[PDB]
Design a protein around this nucleic acid. Structure first.
Ligand SMILES: [Mg+2]
Ligand SMILES: [Mg+2]
Ligand SMILES: [Mg+2]
Ligand SMILES: [Mg+2]
Ligand SMILES: [Mg+2]
Ligand SMILES: [Mg+2]
Ligand SMILES: [Mg+2]
Ligand SMILES: [Mg+2]
Ligand SMILES: [Mg+2]
Ligand SMILES: [Mg+2]
Ligand SMILES: [Mg+2]
Ligand SMILES: [Mg+2]
Ligand SMILES: [Mg+2]
Ligand SMILES: [Mg+2]
Ligand SMILES: [Mg+2]
Ligand SMILES: [Mg+2]
Ligand SMILES: [Mg+2]
Ligand SMILES: [Mg+2]
Ligand SMILES: [Mg+2]
Ligand SMILES: [Mg+2]
Ligand SMILES: [Mg+2]
Ligand SMILES: [Mg+2]
Ligand SMILES: [Mg+2]
Ligand SMILES: [Mg+2]
Ligand SMILES: [Mg+2]
Ligand SMILES: [Mg+2]
Ligand SMILES: [Mg+2]
Ligand SMILES: [Mg+2]
Ligand SMILES: [Mg+2]
Ligand SMILES: [Mg+2]
Ligand SMILES: [Mg+2]
Ligand SMILES: [Mg+2]
Ligand SMILES: [Mg+2]
Ligand SMILES: [Mg+2]
Ligand SMILES: [Mg+2]
Ligand SMILES: [Mg+2]
Ligand SMILES: [Mg+2]
Ligand SMILES: [Mg+2]
Ligand SMILES: [Mg+2]
Ligand SMILES: [Mg+2]
Ligand SMILES: [Mg+2]
Ligand SMILES: [Mg+2]
Ligand SMILES: [Mg+2]
Ligand SMILES: [Mg+2]
Ligand SMILES: [Mg+2]
Ligand SMILES: [Mg+2]
Ligand SMILES: [Mg+2]
Ligand SMILES: [Mg+2]
Ligand SMILES: [Mg+2]
Ligand SMILES: [Mg+2]
Ligand SMILES: [Mg+2]
Ligand SMILES: [Mg+2]
Ligand SMILES: [Mg+2]
Ligand SMILES: [Mg+2]
Ligand SMILES: [Mg+2]
Ligand SMILES: [Mg+2]
Ligand SMILES: [Mg+2]
Ligand SMILES: [Mg+2]
Ligand SMILES: [Mg+2]
Ligand SMILES: [Mg+2]
Ligand SMILES: [Mg+2]
Ligand SMILES: [Mg+2]
Ligand SMILES: [Mg+2]
Ligand SMILES: [Mg+2]
Ligand SMILES: [Zn+2]
Lengths: 98, 91, 139
RNA sequence: GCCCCUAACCCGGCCAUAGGCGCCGGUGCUACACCCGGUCUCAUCAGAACCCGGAAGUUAAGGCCGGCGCCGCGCUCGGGAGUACUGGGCUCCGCGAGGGCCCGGGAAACCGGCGUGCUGGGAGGGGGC
RNA sequence: UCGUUGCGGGUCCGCUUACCCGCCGCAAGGCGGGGACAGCGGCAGGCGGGCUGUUCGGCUGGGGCGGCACACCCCUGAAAAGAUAUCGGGGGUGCCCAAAGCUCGGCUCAGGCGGGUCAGAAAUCCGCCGUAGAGUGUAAGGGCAAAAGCCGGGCUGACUGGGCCCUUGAACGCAAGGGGCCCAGGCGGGAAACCGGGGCCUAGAGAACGCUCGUGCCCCCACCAGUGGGGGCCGGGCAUGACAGAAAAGUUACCCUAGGAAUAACCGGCUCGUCGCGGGUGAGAGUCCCCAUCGACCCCGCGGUUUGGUACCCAGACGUCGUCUCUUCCCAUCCUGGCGGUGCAGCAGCCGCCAAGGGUGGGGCUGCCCGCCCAUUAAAGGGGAACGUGAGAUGGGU
RNA sequence: UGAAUCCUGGCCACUGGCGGUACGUGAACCCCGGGUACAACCGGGCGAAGCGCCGCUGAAGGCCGGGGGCCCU
RNA sequence: AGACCAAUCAAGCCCGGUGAUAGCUGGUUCCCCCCGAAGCGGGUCUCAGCCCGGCCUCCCCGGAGGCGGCCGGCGGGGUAGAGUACUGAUCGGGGCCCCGGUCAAACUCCGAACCUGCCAGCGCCGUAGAAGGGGGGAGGCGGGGGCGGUGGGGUAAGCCUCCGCUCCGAGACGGGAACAACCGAGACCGGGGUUAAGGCCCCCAAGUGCGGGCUUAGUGU
RNA sequence: CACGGGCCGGGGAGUUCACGGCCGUGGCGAGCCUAAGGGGUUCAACCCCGGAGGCGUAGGGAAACCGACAGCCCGCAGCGGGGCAACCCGCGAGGGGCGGGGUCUUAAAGGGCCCGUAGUCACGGCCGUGAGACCAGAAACCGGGCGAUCUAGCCCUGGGCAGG
RNA sequence: CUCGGCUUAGUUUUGCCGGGGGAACGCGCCGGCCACUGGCCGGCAAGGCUAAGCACGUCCCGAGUCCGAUAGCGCACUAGUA
RNA sequence: GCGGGGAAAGGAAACAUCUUAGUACCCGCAGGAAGGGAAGCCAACAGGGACCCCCUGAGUAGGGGCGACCGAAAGGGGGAUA
């Protein structure tokens, strides 16, 4: 039977947490202020799944283009196609590697 | 599912919230002067097979629930769909 | 009752059900269909097989094909006793133990079929009791 | 104002080395508490709680600090172990499923050892500008 | 039913001249009967395979029956980025809810223990423990403890007008559907922050044409103005589940055409579960005694001899069962030759080994093959050769 | 159906055919009302056969099983 | 008897519509030169067809960066193994607990090799034109072999169905006795030389080559 | 051991038109071209006339209706300056981005389409769609006619059938 | 006008045929893309004829980037013949 | 050439409305041509002025399982002119 494609269709491992990470996450990711040109890493937080980007963007590095209210507009790539991810900071981490 | 007979709803004409009476949508009667009905009656005249398709196999169990919300202040009517489910009971 | 036996044959032989309740046009119990109906009578049977070894000859139909398929009511058990929700379970158990038929139709007051009692239902009553969310009515 | 040093208090980050059980001590001008009342704001079955007004009593408890033991947890430590597993090559073995050699990576359980919160800002206190 | 359909009298009666039926007559016309009926034409409803045209879907370890792997969702397969198939495995979906939706506050669950009037395993009360062992509508997976659960207060954001992005649809074209972030209008809850464009997240989903409803001091309708009516743009609904959307039943052995070894039947190839044959093991039987003869429970094999699995070759074609006739080969040997064991006294029997030179026959029954049977016999073995051999026959069966 | 001869059982549920008072349904015409300066259009009334319904029919196409106590089902 | 109706009948013959239509089968005619595929994804009354993408080719615009490799910095991941701690399975010992043992595609405290994102460098390609864009023409939308994922299924299969590198199809030639895809290796034409795989008793170019040991079965080669 | 050809000679398959897209050239250019037809000719050629009409020059909107650029930045070529060169700097057509403008929707914001120049006519080529459409191939269906010397049935009128 | 039908781009709107109904008269009648009303505009159906300019090819004449005896018409010939 | 009767195959990748096509074919009737022809017209308040045929309008309006596909007229330029 063909693969089904719901928005979260092969995400058991990705959305699972170890026992020591159970419960609410810390709030420091909320407090980073990103400006255009900043580099961020998409690190999905499973306790806020409805605002999380698609599983294909986990671990990708994007560039902040701007803000939309409280979300950040991030320019990234899936293979060769440019993608625009709009997401809240709880699903973002600063990329220190350049 | 039960649904109220009166709700407080935004009225675009009044540009404010007003009380709205709720009722089921009922389709009006097909009028013989409708252009598509005039064309059909023309097509039905003369010899030939039945001229148009007529569906025989149906698959939906329920129709979409459509409700008419009438503004009690100005009479503006909003007809909205609540999705496909069995007929609501207006309470 | 008017269904073709080919529609339900695999579900019986494969054991996915222990029997069928056969309904008339009004939803009443016309009868019962189990494997024993297929063992008692061969009115349903038609031979088949792989294509024949047609070589060096003029034969125009090399493979047997089934064309007139028997209807269910032609081979069903007619006139089975039906049960009501207030029917004693011991009368059903006596029937099943005596005749080895493990399906009994259940009808409402108007005779319309609303379900059936299987031999697995009877065992459940004798072993545990009522099913979840059910109450034992007076007999 | 400013800079530096610095307990318990306030706001935090990481979220057990911070948790849990038991035992032994320290701390009280100030600060934190327990504490005293219910007219007022507010509150409930209940001034217990919440909220308000206080300051008689107390470090018995909480908080904070030090020590010991056990459990739990942590560690870029020793062993386990270059073991298990693995990327690349092979006219190398085996009847075969499979194994072996060479180049490159390399665990985990467990046993032992060590550890048992660290830290950012502020008030207060001390010293100078 | 409209017309043919006329004339008198009060829907009814009558009449004849229409019209119809028959007789006579070359014709003219006469006679009799019926009679505004019937008959005939148009229109309308019913019955109507009598006749005409067509449709009788797909996937498929050949087709068919079944199933829906045909549209969706979760886990696994899936090989630690992404993608990933099979008629692969385990399940689910075509809803339900005015709350099971929004928000604010308070609280803590399953279970256990101690005490307490009925009272009890389980009711309400006091206390202690309790990492979630509960709950969260609904599959599965994920999330959640001053909550995402339970209770209570106030509500309708399951809102109007729009924009951008993600997924469906990987990198890489491409519906509908779903989700996210916002701007404006106007609200709900809240001290505020903030949250609300349904349900904690991942499923419950429908083009064109047609119709219908909503909306606008809205646009158009043929020289001009008016009235009725019609059309248009924007949005909601009515449906295609074969779910990127025809309106659709059989049967052919009377069959026909185009093709296909993309695909079955025979033979061949591969495989050997099945079939046949061999070996290891030794519980147990054999008076005693495992192995004279056996061989439970298990295990290792060989053959290609039954049956199946597969679909590689052959559809401009390899003549389809058996038998007859005729030749040859194998050995896992039935007899004949040699040897051994025995639970071998003799007569017989049983078992093993070497050995394929020769023999292995005649009948009854059935289309058979196989098998059963009859009288003999040293014995009346089994297999292979395009299931040897139909350009050799036969033609009983299929 | 298939000479003759002895015979030819039970069943009208189904599929057909036929008969029928009432009732429901059932087209065009027609009538009434609304609408339209007229129409289109909208509603109602009347209502044939037929169908529903009730009966007859098997030398019509055919069918002829269970359970229970000759009886019931 | 679906018989027969002029060798024609489950619907005659003649001429006409008519060059009926055919996603199917057959055929499709001179030379050299350049580049050079595909049988994958999605949709389709779709499964022997077709369309949109991937892959080929030709032309043009554009204008400096690009990435089948490696190192490092900064990240992601939950497979192999491991474990039996959550959810389950399971054999024993000891007093619902403790100890030992057997397991897991739909279990996971841990956790590689490995793959992958951004940046910097190396390496290579690129102004004789990177990225990007436009236009014309396609073919093709049946694939197959080896090796690897115990991939998943199956008794197994020269079996079915996925994932990846390479090769055949579309690739000559040497070796493998023959032999598309095994090994070696990539061919403009002629000649000389040296090697690869593999071989060197004869067939058959090159050793009846060297040391040690084993086998007596022509085992084997 | 898949199918086709005995041999030889001769014959034997992408064509034409219309419309569309694109390319390579040629003419003219904010314009380009004539059609039918007319006059002349050395008479289907050729010279001249014919501008009807078609396409372009402006778009948006269903429609009523309304109706458009030289402002800024980046920057290839090129040019200029400096430098032994490397390279740096300036201007910068075309190209790219913004801004501005026309119009539709909306209460508006936002959003859609469009705007600061190139077309048109022809010749050759490739491809698409129709026409028979590269060549060969059904079983069929319909129109109008022909047939009962065969055969099937029947009607009218003749003939035949030893012997037992 | 109405009903049925064939047809037409003719669409609530083309032409006609058939069944049924059926005018008026110049102070009238008809048309102006649904019907009606008012205005304006244009006309006079239901009778008949009509040259020229246009289709065709048995036939005659001319021409040709056409074919050249398996080609070209079936026929270059005692071919619509045997 | 004029009047009438009148298909299917094929296409729509099935098929019935539709198309093919008022075609093939059939029946009737003329001429060297036939038919048409002298406003109950077209237009839009400005004006054309019988008819047929050619070029255009134009694959536009419009018809159509609004699918395949079908498809004018007025106006303009000509031949000729009564
Ligand atoms: Mg897919
Ligand atoms: Mg949500
Ligand atoms: Mg057949
Ligand atoms: Mg009458
Ligand atoms: Mg009549
Ligand atoms: Mg029929
Ligand atoms: Mg169908
Ligand atoms: Mg099929
Ligand atoms: Mg099926
Ligand atoms: Mg993955
Ligand atoms: Mg849900
Ligand atoms: Mg809450
Ligand atoms: Mg899709
Ligand atoms: Mg893609
Ligand atoms: Mg969906
Ligand atoms: Mg007009
Ligand atoms: Mg589909
Ligand atoms: Mg053979
Ligand atoms: Mg076979
Ligand atoms: Mg066996
Ligand atoms: Mg033994
Ligand atoms: Mg076999
Ligand atoms: Mg094959
Ligand atoms: Mg072969
Ligand atoms: Mg052959
Ligand atoms: Mg042969
Ligand atoms: Mg042959
Ligand atoms: Mg032997
Ligand atoms: Mg044979
Ligand atoms: Mg023969
Ligand atoms: Mg032979
Ligand atoms: Mg026979
Ligand atoms: Mg026979
Ligand atoms: Mg009888
Ligand atoms: Mg027959
Ligand atoms: Mg016929
Ligand atoms: Mg026929
Ligand atoms: Mg013919
Ligand atoms: Mg090349
Ligand atoms: Mg083929
Ligand atoms: Mg790296
Ligand atoms: Mg493992
Ligand atoms: Mg293990
Ligand atoms: Mg991977
Ligand atoms: Mg394929
Ligand atoms: Mg492969
Ligand atoms: Mg090929
Ligand atoms: Mg070789
Ligand atoms: Mg030599
Ligand atoms: Mg062939
Ligand atoms: Mg041949
Ligand atoms: Mg074509
Ligand atoms: Mg036909
Ligand atoms: Mg005919
Ligand atoms: Mg005769
Ligand atoms: Mg007059
Ligand atoms: Mg000739
Ligand atoms: Mg010659
Ligand atoms: Mg044709
Ligand atoms: Mg068709
Ligand atoms: Mg057809
Ligand atoms: Mg004339
Ligand atoms: Mg004339
Ligand atoms: Mg036409
Ligand atoms: Zn209002």
């Amino acid at each position: 039977v063909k693969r089904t494609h719901g928005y979260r269709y092969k995400s058991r491992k990705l959305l699972s947490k170890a026992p020591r990470e159970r419960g609410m996450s810390g709030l420091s990711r909320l407090l980073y202020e990103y400006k255009p040109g900043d580099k961020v890493v998409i690190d999905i937080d499973p306790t806020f799944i409805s605002t999380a980007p698609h599983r294909r963007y986990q671990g990708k590095v994007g560039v902040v283009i701007g803000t939309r209210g409280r979300a950040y507009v991030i320019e990234t790539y899936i293979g060769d196609k440019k993608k625009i991810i709009i997401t809240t900071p709880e699903h973002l981490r600063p990329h220190l590697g350049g | 599912m039960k649904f109220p007979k009166s709700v407080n709803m935004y009225c675009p004409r009044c540009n404010t919230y007003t009380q709205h009476s709720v009722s089921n949508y009922h389709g009006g009667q097909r009028r013989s002067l409708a252009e598509g009905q005039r064309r059909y009656e023309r097509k039905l005249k003369g010899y030939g097979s039945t001229p148009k398709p007529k569906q025989k196999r149906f698959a939906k169990v329920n129709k979409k629930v459509t409700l008419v919300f009438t503004c009690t202040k100005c009479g503006y009517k909003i007809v909205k769909s609540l999705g496909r489910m069995k007929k609501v009971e207006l309470v | 009752a008017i269904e073709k036996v080919s529609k339900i044959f695999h579900k019986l032989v494969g054991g996915e059900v222990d029997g069928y309740v056969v309904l008339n046009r009004e939803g009443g119990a016309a009868g019962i269909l189990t494997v024993w109906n297929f063992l008692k009578s061969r009115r349903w049977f038609r031979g088949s097989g792989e294509p024949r070894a047609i070589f060096g000859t003029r034969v125009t139909r090399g493979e047997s094909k089934p064309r007139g398929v028997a209807r269910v009511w032609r081979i069903m058990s007619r006139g089975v006793a039906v049960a009501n929700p207030d029917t004693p379970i011991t009368d059903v158990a006596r029937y099943m133990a005596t005749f080895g038929i493990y399906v009994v139709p259940v009808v409402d007051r108007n005779g319309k079929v609303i379900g059936a009692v299987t031999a697995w239902d009877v065992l459940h009553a004798y072993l545990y009791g009522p099913k979840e969310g059910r109450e034992d009515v007076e007999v």
